[PDB]
């Protein structure tokens with residue numbers, strides 16, 4: 002029964018055909034279980050290890066490498082000679098990377114928990130029911146509970162399903178619904194029906210929600226829903242139906258692979274087309290088999306050369322580093338790829354209480370009626386100092402301190418504040434300051450009583466623990482609190498019934514003290530208190546009261562106002578039914594207006610500045626609050642969201658106003674709105690949907706399982722460090738301090754991390770471009786391989802990985818937050834930059850091919866064959882060049898390859914320096930601007946010499962130490978790269994501005 006809350010207790014029994022004293026019969030249990038299933042959320046997909054492992058091979062690039070591993074594995078097999086010592090090295094290396102690669106991937110999935118499986122923490126293992134086949138109650142597994150079951154719950158129990166309370170055994174029943182309604186304070190439940198069929202959970206006072214806890218009491222009820230049909234199960238279904246896209250970088254990264262894959266095949270076709278002349282050679286002769294090997298061999302080098310094998314690890318290292326940095330600033334990022342999206346945040350939706358404000362309540366003003374003589378009228382306004390919950394402060398009249406006792410009206414004001422209050426104070430000897438015990442609003446009233454001290458007590462005679470609740474205790478001893486009529490959003494008021502302490506045999510002298518929202522409370526007042534006397538409430542005086550309330554709640558004071566009243570002649574105790582909260586308003590009528598207290602929940606001290614940063618960064622800020630519209634707007638003006646005197650009629654809505662707009666208009670309202678007051682439980686999600694229909698990167702805050710859907714949907718869900726574990730697991734980030742300004746600081750950190758990432762990414766991909774040209778040039782000219790797979794891999798993983806990582810630590814621009822949000826569609830490389838890397842690539846390709854070619858010719862140590870043709874052949878099966886001797890297989894010399902690799906390494910240590918800045922010359926921004934970079938280069942070169950001299954290695958890499966002469970030819974070919982890019986940068990700065 003989805004509508005149970007609106008049904009009478011009897012109608013629910015009738016609906017299910019069950020008796021409240023016996024429960025369901027075994028036949029009913031059978032049929033019901035059959036019809037509704039078990040009371041549990043479905044179990045998550047059985048993603049097995051094998052499936053997991055296979056998934057680490059879905060990527061196009063990992064497939065290419067896999068293929069190349071196979072070819073490499075085949076060649077290191079169908080070859081002639083016993084040089085097997087360095088045969089299977091190449092294939093094992095590739096495979097080893099893919100292996101370690103899959104390992105990591107799997108390691109993550111094993112430690113990644115999802116929010117949905119986190120909801121299963123709120124479902125108890127057992128529940129208690131009454132079934133016809135037994136007199137006493139029997140506890141069974143909660144999953145075996147079904148709609149119709151008569152259930153029993155008691156204090157300490159975790160509610161097993163959504164239940165319609167049938168009968169409350171205890172004096173009252175209290176429930177902790179924090180996880181679902183935010184209401185941290187336990188709420189009283191009743192059994193009467195709640196008329197509205199569309200009432201939100203907070204108002205279903207006759208319902209117990211599965212996953213919730215009994216704070217106090219014992220009750221009997223009937224199960225209305227179970228499984229995914231409960232409030233929490235519906236939350237679980239929204240979440241499961243929410244798909245989160247890949248981050249902008251993942252999308253670009255994936256398109257890069259699709260394109261890289263398309264290029265590799267095209268370069269293979271080209272290498273083939275350029276050698277179509279082989280069909281013009283005689284059939285007999287020539288090593289066909291030793292030719293196909295040549296082609297397959299370059300394919301392997303081709304694939305290894307185009308893939309930036311070390312990129313994923315570089316990104317991850319930068320993200321982990323930045324992430325630990327963000328933590329020190331109170332931003333706990335859960336998803337590494339989220340740091341990127343964070344920098345892109347274009348809209349931040351923030352709850353007010355506790356994030357934009359401190360949630361530290363404090364009464365600042367209050368007033369009573371001074372005189373009412375016909376059309377004439379005067380009030381008695383006061384101020385109170387102290388913003389802490391500590392009883393340290395004073396009352397003032399026109400800044401002049403006064404004594405509260407000299408005004409009777411204040412004595413009663415204080416009485417109401419003390420009595421009609423379920424909160425208190427507690428001096429924490431540990432921390433050294435007073436803390437609240439209950440809701441912040443009521444505690445502020447408690448704190449106010451101590452500051453007022455309407456009876457003058459020896460408080461300065463008591464300790465710090467006794468000072469806490471002194472003046473309250475005094476007023477407590479003068480009035481006996483019979484019972485209290487709880488607050489309910491319908492009437493927006495609360496009251497307590499009291500009778501004097503010292504009163505003999507008599508049935509007269511009782512009073513009701515009412516506290517609540519002004520509008521409603523004042524409308525039920527027929528009298529106004531003037532000191533100790535009373536007079537009939539009039540139109541004039543009412544307006545006077547309401548004008549001040551409006552000023553306080555809507556002016557720059559942004560105060561939350563409460564009207565305090567007292568029913569002088571409260572109905573006889575026997576004539577009141579304390580069970581139907583629906584009658585409480587009628588009982589709180591014919592009241593006498595006593596006063597108004599205005600309290601403040603102060604903005605965080607850093608919120609003002611952070612909001613300004615957002616305006617500077619082009620980041621829109623939307624506040625979500627429970628304040629009525631007026632005060633919401635006033636607060637938005639106060640903190641900077643709205644201009645002090647700007648029009649906002651069309652930029653602020655309550656949930657009601659928003660629901661009344663047609664779908665088309667809601668979408669529009671979301672693009673311009675900055676204030677949402679009294680918002681429904683589904684609104685955050687709809688607001689995120691509309692915002693996304695404008696391609697906005699949205700950050701949204703939340704804390705309870707009810708915010709879980711919007712958190713998951715938003716590009717950057719933000720959870721409170723003091724919030725629920727479910728909200729956290731559904732968010733990309735957690736605020737350890739719950740402070741709004743932590744979001745802004747994370748965004749900035751996000752913008753900085755990405756700029757540096759843009760650099761080391763272009764750096765790495767840049768080098769792959771040169772490698773492919775080198776492998777291409779060699780393949781086109783039919784030259785001996787200048788660079789082999791193992792060398793490239795060492796370069797792309799180690800040699801270049803260090804500088805790349807170092808670049809991650811590039812100092813951030815100073816105008817980071819003075820620029821609008823970066824567009825997600827912004828490519829990493831295009832336009833003039835694409836040309837620059839086109840050029841650098843050609844350069845690197847020619848430089849490495851030419852470097853090996855050099856040794857093979859114009860060099861001493863090498864077969865000085867100037868303008869000779871290595872291209873001519875590579876078989877000596879004809880021997881045209883050599884005229885006398887016994888040597889041929891020298892084309893496989895390590896020296897030439899060592900020349901190419903050294904050129905690569907040197908041009909890359911150079912191009913890294915060219916990477917410190919996109920367009921700024923090394924003249925303007927010196928290499929030493931990043932010390933890590935310089936140092937990384939020193940380590941890379943050292944590692945280079947390492948693989949050249951430490952015997953085991955030079956064999957594996959096929960390298961040979963160079964002569965001081967050769968090294969200089971490397972510097973003759975490399976160093977000039979800096980000048981090339983310098984010239985291209987110069988062009989971007991002077992002939993490309995506007």
Ligand SMILES: C/C=C(/C)C(=O)O[C@H]1C(C)=C2[C@H]([C@@H]1OC(=O)CCCCCCC)[C@@](C)(OC(C)=O)C[C@H](OC(=O)CCC)[C@@]1(O)[C@H]2OC(=O)[C@@]1(C)O
Nearest residue numbers: 254256257260261264307769770773777829830835838839
């Ligand atoms: C890794 C090495 C190579 C050589 C490769 O094929 O990269 C191409 C490629 C896939 C792209 C290109 C490369 O295209 C070329 O170099 C043109 C063909 C000439 C080479 C042929 C030799 C005979 C990038 C590398 O070229 C230059 C010169 O900068 C730039 C950019 O890449 C990025 O922005 C990186 C995204 C993370 C991409 O055009 C990109 O495709 C896209 O979708 C983009 C938008 O991504």
Ligand SMILES: Nc1ncnc2c1ncn2[C@@H]1O[C@H](COP(=O)(O)OP(=O)(O)O)[C@@H](O)[C@H]1O
Nearest residue numbers: 442488490493494495516517518562563627628
């Ligand atoms: N404990 C209370 N007792 C009586 N009235 C209250 C209490 N708390 C709030 N009110 C009033 O009722 C209105 C709405 O309360 P509530 O729904 O709890 O709002 P909020 O989420 O801003 O705390 C408030 O504007 C306030 O004036």
Ligand SMILES: [Mg+2]
Nearest residue numbers: 182183704705
């Ligand atoms: Mg909440």
Ligand SMILES: [Mg+2]
Nearest residue numbers: 184440442627
């Ligand atoms: Mg509240």
Ligand code: NA
Nearest residue numbers: 712713715718
């Ligand atoms: Na999200």
